[PDB]
Amino acid sequence: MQTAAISWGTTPSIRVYTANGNKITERCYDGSNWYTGAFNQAGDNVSATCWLSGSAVHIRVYATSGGSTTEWCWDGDGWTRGAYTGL
Amino acid sequence: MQTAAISWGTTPSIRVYTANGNKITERCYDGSNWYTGAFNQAGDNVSATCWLSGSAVHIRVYATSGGSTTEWCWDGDGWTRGAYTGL
Amino acid sequence: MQTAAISWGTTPSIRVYTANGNKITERCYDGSNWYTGAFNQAGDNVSATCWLSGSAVHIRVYATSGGSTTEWCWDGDGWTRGAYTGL
Ligand SMILES: CC(=O)N[C@H]1[C@H](O[C@@H]2[C@@H](O)[C@H](O)O[C@H](CO)[C@@H]2O)O[C@H](CO)[C@@H](O[C@@H]2O[C@H](CO)[C@H](O)[C@H](O)[C@H]2O)[C@@H]1O[C@@H]1O[C@@H](C)[C@@H](O)[C@@H](O)[C@@H]1O
Ligand SMILES: CC(=O)N[C@H]1[C@H](O[C@@H]2[C@@H](O)[C@H](O)O[C@H](CO)[C@@H]2O)O[C@H](CO)[C@@H](O[C@@H]2O[C@H](CO)[C@H](O)[C@H](O)[C@H]2O)[C@@H]1O[C@@H]1O[C@@H](C)[C@@H](O)[C@@H](O)[C@@H]1O
Ligand SMILES: CC(=O)N[C@H]1[C@H](O[C@@H]2[C@@H](O)[C@H](O)O[C@H](CO)[C@@H]2O)O[C@H](CO)[C@@H](O[C@@H]2O[C@H](CO)[C@H](O)[C@H](O)[C@H]2O)[C@@H]1O[C@@H]1O[C@@H](C)[C@@H](O)[C@@H](O)[C@@H]1O
Ligand SMILES: CC(=O)N[C@@H]1[C@@H](O[C@@H]2O[C@@H](C)[C@@H](O)[C@@H](O)[C@@H]2O)[C@H](O)[C@@H](CO)O[C@H]1O
Ligand SMILES: CC(=O)N[C@@H]1[C@@H](O[C@@H]2O[C@@H](C)[C@@H](O)[C@@H](O)[C@@H]2O)[C@H](O)[C@@H](CO)O[C@H]1O
Ligand SMILES: CC(=O)N[C@@H]1[C@@H](O[C@@H]2O[C@@H](C)[C@@H](O)[C@@H](O)[C@@H]2O)[C@H](O)[C@@H](CO)O[C@H]1O
């Protein structure tokens, strides 16, 4: 089981991505309880990065399944497939 | 052997967490030599994130041992167990 | 195959490091297409962190090959070996 962690803002908000059993899932903290996030994609390995434009977070998650990495994008309205390609 | 890296401030300070042999340890840079940090917890996988409140760093380390992830918190006065729960 | 991801600035710029087959490589985004970066070093595991001094990025990549981690530094003019030592 393998994780990636990101955080932003002053609360802060935290997101922890966990790869387990070929599934990546997401747990979320926004200042009170931890909860399960919307992100669900295939993979055995995960990394992530984020940035703020004002108060709005943008997240990129790099989900690797076997020999292929897929980027997933959060830009305020759902998870969308990004343009990233690997070697 | 698997690592996680965080950094903050303008020096910068860097912390590198290494999982090896079911032990996670910490090496630290604050502008001169690298040294061994106080963090020691069980795990075969590690991620980390941090933020600043003014000059004061807050660190969260996610230590995974088998099928369970535990959060460890640095908030200026020692490492304490966090509220994070996984699936 | 295992990745690390960093990002900076407002574009943003993103760097994704991938360890595969004992080689770590780098893919780069600066606002248009993804491209292959200059970084190439040995390892089966990678983490990374970065910071800005004004507009200038500084990157540290921690490349682990077997039982040894080596730090690699980007400070505006090529990749150089850092002072990091592990246990
Ligand atoms: C508190 C919370 O849950 N916020 C989530 C929110 O997730 C909800 C679920 O709580 C609910 O059960 O289901 C609905 C779908 O019917 C939804 O998935 O979704 C919102 C809207 O996308 C998002 O809240 C925003 O979060 C940011 C954090 O900076 C900010 O506070 C903003 O004002 C909120 O509106 C939350 O979604 C999670 O966080 C995202 C950044 C991303 O990680 C998601 O995958 C998470 O589910
Ligand atoms: C330079 C240094 O060592 N700072 C450490 C400091 O660690 C010391 C050890 O050096 C000494 O050998 O043992 C004592 C215990 O008897 C202690 O563990 O501990 C201080 C206080 O917690 C902390 O320094 C603070 O670091 C921040 C960095 O932003 C800042 O400069 C502040 O002004 C300092 O007081 C250092 O602890 C390390 O960094 C922490 C953030 C965390 O990573 C720890 O696990 C590290 O040991
Ligand atoms: C757009 C781009 O490619 N920028 C790279 C640039 O890489 C070039 C290659 O494009 C070309 O094919 O080969 C030459 C060697 O002959 C070179 O490797 O290299 C520049 C200069 O080092 C660097 O651009 C700078 O990037 C920063 C990003 O913040 C900023 O925009 C600045 O103004 C640019 O000058 C790019 O190098 C990449 O990014 C680095 C941070 C690091 O990740 C490298 O390993 C990447 O190759
Ligand atoms: C926000 C931005 O800089 N660009 C968006 C486009 O690219 C997506 O995000 C960037 C950061 C990088 O992760 C890409 O791989 C990813 O595809 C995106 O394609 C476009 C879609 O309409 O939206 C831009 O805002
Ligand atoms: C600093 C903060 O926002 N909350 C602290 C509490 O939660 C701890 O930190 C947050 C960021 C998250 O990592 C939690 O899982 C973690 O438990 C903490 O329980 C409380 C203890 O007295 O202190 C708050 O400051
Ligand atoms: C930029 C800085 O704080 N120090 C540089 C020196 O150390 C290198 O960078 C730091 C952040 C840390 O990663 C070290 O392990 C790494 O060696 C560097 O040795 C020196 C070389 O001339 O340049 C400093 O600017």
Residue numbers in the entry:
A (entry chain A), B (entry chain A), C (entry chain A): 1 to 87
Quote the study's own text.
BambL was cocrystallised with the Lex tetrasaccharide and crystals belonging to the P213 spacegroup with cell parameters a = b = c = 81.4 Å and α = β = γ = 90° appeared after 5 days. The complex structure was solved by molecular replacement and two molecules were found in the asymmetric unit which led to a solvent content of 46.5%. Each belongs to a trimer generated by applying crystallographic three-fold symmetry. The final model was refined in the resolution range between 40.7 and 1.6 Å to R and Rfree values of 15.3 and 18.9 respectively. The initial electronic density maps revealed clearly the presence of the fucose moiety in the four available binding sites (two per monomers) and of a variable number of additional sugars depending on the binding site. In the intermolecular site of A molecule and in the intramolecular site of B molecule only the αFuc1-3GlcNAc moiety could be fitted in the density whereas the other residues are too disordered to be located. In both cases, the disaccharide adopted an unusual conformation with of Ψ torsion angle (approx −60°) corresponding to a secondary minimum in the low energy map. In the two other sites, clear electron density was observed for the whole Lex tetrasaccharide. Solving the crystal structure of BambL/Lewis x complex demonstrated that indeed, the fucose is bound with stacking to Trp, but that either the adjacent glycosidic linkages or the GlcNAc ring are distorted in order to adjust. BambL is therefore the first protein that binds Lewis oligosaccharide in conformations that are very different than their solution shape.
BambL from B. ambifaria is a trimeric lectin arranged in a β-propeller fold with two similar binding sites per monomer, resulting in a hexameric arrangement of the fucose binding sites. Both lectins were shown to bind to a large variety of fucosylated oligosaccharides with LecB having higher affinity for the Lewis a epitope and BambL for the H-type 2 epitope. Despite the fact that BambL was described as a fucose-binding lectin with broad specificity, the present analysis indicated its preference for H type 2 and Lewis y (Ley) oligosaccharides. The active-site in BambL is deeper than in LecB, constraining the oligosaccharide conformation and allowing more contacts between the ligands and the surrounding residues.
